[PDB]
Design a protein around this ligand. Structure first.
Ligand SMILES: *[C@@H]1O[C@H](CO)[C@@H](O[C@@H]2O[C@H](CO)[C@@H](O)[C@H](O)[C@H]2NC(C)=O)[C@H](O)[C@H]1NC(C)=O
Ligand SMILES: *[C@@H]1O[C@H](CO)[C@@H](O)[C@H](O)[C@H]1NC(C)=O
Ligand SMILES: *[C@@H]1O[C@H](CO)[C@@H](O)[C@H](O)[C@H]1NC(C)=O
Ligand SMILES: *[C@@H]1O[C@H](CO)[C@@H](O)[C@H](O)[C@H]1NC(C)=O
Ligand SMILES: *[C@@H]1O[C@H](CO)[C@@H](O)[C@H](O)[C@H]1NC(C)=O
Ligand SMILES: *[C@@H]1O[C@H](CO)[C@@H](O)[C@H](O)[C@H]1NC(C)=O
Ligand SMILES: *[C@@H]1O[C@H](CO)[C@@H](O)[C@H](O)[C@H]1NC(C)=O
Lengths: 49, 276, 49
């Protein structure tokens, strides 16, 4: 979670991306839009002689 | 009290073309810079809208059937339109709700109402005073009432073109009147101007009753008692249809344009390509 | 025994550290007790939502 900088209409509560995934959420207690980011996925490969 | 006004000129049910206006935000979900197709109730493009006129030549407060949510537009400069009454039968037997800006505040009373068959506010000319109006002669079994914040409500008379356009969408979804509102400051001479508007929601009212009928609420501007005069006023009533629409959202997450799939074969293509 | 080359074998994972847990502030107590302990219960024909 980071702060979200996209402009947000007051009635707009959840911010969602192309796939309709919430990339931005409004905190209930502090109506701060928050950028939502994925958690660091990748593949483990082994180089070897 | 509860006056009924005689020999009102018939509205004649004049019809006009609809336009790209009548669009509202489907949901609070924020989508930006994205093309989205959605099924919902909307105002079809170029559809027929019934113009009901309270200019003064005619006064009409007809019971208008509430079908699947209505798009209301009021083109006015003196804020002559005051509110609306939504009810199934409105014969004092069934539940009805009154949403107006009566004197200074937004009032929404869901109560069984002795609906005056001619409900009209009484506004004094050159005094700018609302004489008490009996919107309901009495009230009994009042279920839901909400008084909003007080506001300065302009009731004086201004001569000109209708400088203001108040547009509302009333959707009776489940037992909820969902009202999506907007305003346009452009003044039009005598026509509902062509254009698109995006209606932000205001109230998700939980009335929980069936609404089959509704009547807008006008006001009197009689320069003399019992004369029953009115100023220039006009408005448009459009029904909504369950057709899918194609909406473009800018980077600001604001509705910028839309396309009705069913309207035109090229529009159908635009939908199927999901491109403009 | 493995001959020379590159080989993809695993999928890296980042685990969540903790939880944010944000709800609204409503603290009023619900009347479900009142509904359940309603002194009189209407008939099934007069069942009330
Ligand atoms: C979204 O809205 C903002 C605010 O209304 C727009 O930002 C403005 O952009 C203009 C032109 O670049 C500037 O003159 C203003 O100073 C900006 N204001 C703010 C508060 O940023 C932005 O351009 C809009 N984006 C759209 C319509 O795509
Ligand atoms: C919720 O309550 C907390 C604790 O007092 C407060 O810090 C926060 O601002 C409140 N938020 C809202 C939206 O009431
Ligand atoms: C709209 O009105 C025109 C003429 O007034 C009519 O030909 C047309 O069928 C109407 N469309 C409707 C009622 O959907
Ligand atoms: C008001 O409604 C009641 C029943 O709900 C009815 O008996 C009465 O006649 C109504 N008032 C008027 C003025 O008709
Ligand atoms: C308008 O409605 C409010 C709320 O019900 C009420 O207090 C006020 O007296 C009303 N004014 C008029 C002129 O009916
Ligand atoms: C609802 O209205 C009816 C008459 O229409 C009345 O008999 C009844 O007492 C009302 N209910 C309440 C809770 O006031
Ligand atoms: C409205 O809906 C209710 C509930 O389905 C139904 O009983 C009633 O007949 C409908 N029409 C009117 C005019 O109330």
């Amino acid at each position: 979670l980071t702060p979200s900088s996209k402009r947000f209409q007051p009635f707009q509560q959840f911010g969602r991306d192309v796939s309709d995934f919430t990339d931005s959420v409004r905190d209930p207690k502090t109506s701060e839009i928050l950028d939502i980011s994925p958690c660091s996925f990748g593949g483990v490969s082994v180089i070897t002689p | 009290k509860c006056l009924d006004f005689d020999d009102r000129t018939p509205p004649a049910n004049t019809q006009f073309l609809s336009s790209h206006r009548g669009v509202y935000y489907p949901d609070d979900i924020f989508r930006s810079n994205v093309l989205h197709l959605v099924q919902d109730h909307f105002l079809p493009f170029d559809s027929n809208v019934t113009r009901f006129i309270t200019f003064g030549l005619n006064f009409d407060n007809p019971i208008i059937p509430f079908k699947d949510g209505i798009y209301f537009a009021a083109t006015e400069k003196s804020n002559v339109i005051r509110g609306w009454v939504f009810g199934s039968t409105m014969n004092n037997k069934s539940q009805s709700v009154i949403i107006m800006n009566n004197s200074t505040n937004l009032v929404i009373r869901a109560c069984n109402f002795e609906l005056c068959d001619n409900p009209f506010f009484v506004v004094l000319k050159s005094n700018n005073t609302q004489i008490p109006s009996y919107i309901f002669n009495n009230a009994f079994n009042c279920t839901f009432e909400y008084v909003s914040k007080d506001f300065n409500l302009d009731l004086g008379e201004k001569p000109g073109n209708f400088k203001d356009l108040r547009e509302f969408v009333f959707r009776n979804k489940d037992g909820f009147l969902h009202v999506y509102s907007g305003y346009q400051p452009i003044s039009a001479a005598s026509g509902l101007p062509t254009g698109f508007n995006a209606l932000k929601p205001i109230f998700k009212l939980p009335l929980g009753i069936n609404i089959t009928n509704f009547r807008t609420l006008l006001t009197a501007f009689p320069p003399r008692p019992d004369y029953w005069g009115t100023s220039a006023a006009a408005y448009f009533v459009g029904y909504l249809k369950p057709t899918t629409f194609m909406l473009k959202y800018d980077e600001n997450g604001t509705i910028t344009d839309a396309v009705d799939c069913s309207q035109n074969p090229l529009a159908e293509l635009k939908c199927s390509v999901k491109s403009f | 025994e493995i001959d020379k080359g590159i080989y993809q074998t695993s999928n890296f994972r980042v685990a969540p550290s903790k939880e944010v847990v944000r709800f609204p502030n409503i603290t009023n107590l619900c009347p479900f007790g009142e509904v359940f302990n309603a002194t009189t219960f209407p008939s099934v024909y007069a069942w009330e939502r």
